Amino acid sequence: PGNSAEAWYNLGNAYYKQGDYDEAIEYYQKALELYPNNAEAWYNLGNAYYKQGDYDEAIEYYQKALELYPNNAEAWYNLGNAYYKQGDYDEAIEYYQKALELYP
Amino acid sequence: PGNSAEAWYNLGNAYYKQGDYDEAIEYYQKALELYPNNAEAWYNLGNAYYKQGDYDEAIEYYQKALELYPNNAEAWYNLGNAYYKQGDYDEAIEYYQKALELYP
């Protein structure tokens, strides 16, 4: 359409910035259909789900992001945050500590 | 003797690096006697106590460090660690989150 994975990813980001999380998700998913290994699309998808209060979904996507890009301190942080928002303090701490050991 | 707060602080650091925590503490304390507001001496004193397993002492010193130098992300982190090592997960998380919001 629609042949650059980056373009759909950029559009996801612009909707996300505007607070239109539903739209952002559909674009990120299109980026990932073209390019399933796009760690940055998995990550921002996680963020979009997090912002909606769907912490289970965010966790699953963050996990995929981190499998492909394990030096993303910010994603470790947000993974920690997602567990924190579920009341899983043990896991929040584990991932906060991982985020903090990647700095700088 | 012994008139540069920095010199005593540097010596504290060299002992600390060598694993001689007892000695490191005595030097940091001398730095602080000259210069009670030395945030970096309070901080590394905390570290020295932490390394000995005296987490209460480390916390108290980290607190002083952070009152004087609140943008020290690393000190927030180690404060979190000190509470973590005491099993106070609520406080560990609070300070981990503060450390992580100071990055970068």
Q: If contacts are CB pairs under 8 Å, which of residues 85-104 in chain A contact chain B? A: 89-90, 92-93, 96-97, 99-100, 103-104
Domain boundaries A1-104, CATH class: mainly alpha
CB contact at 8 A, B37 and B68: yes
What are the residue ranges spanned by the domains of chain B?
1-104
Measure Cα distances from B87 to A78, B55, B104 in Å.
23, 11, 28
Q: For A23, left (φ over 0), alpha (ψ -120 to 50), or beta?
A: alpha
The resolution in Å comes to: 2.2
Note whether B19 contacts A: Cβ–Cβ < 8 A: no
Tokens 């590394």, residue? B44
- The closest of B104, B101, B48 to B78, measured between CA atoms, is B48
What's the rounded Cα separation, in Å, for the pair A20 and A12? 9
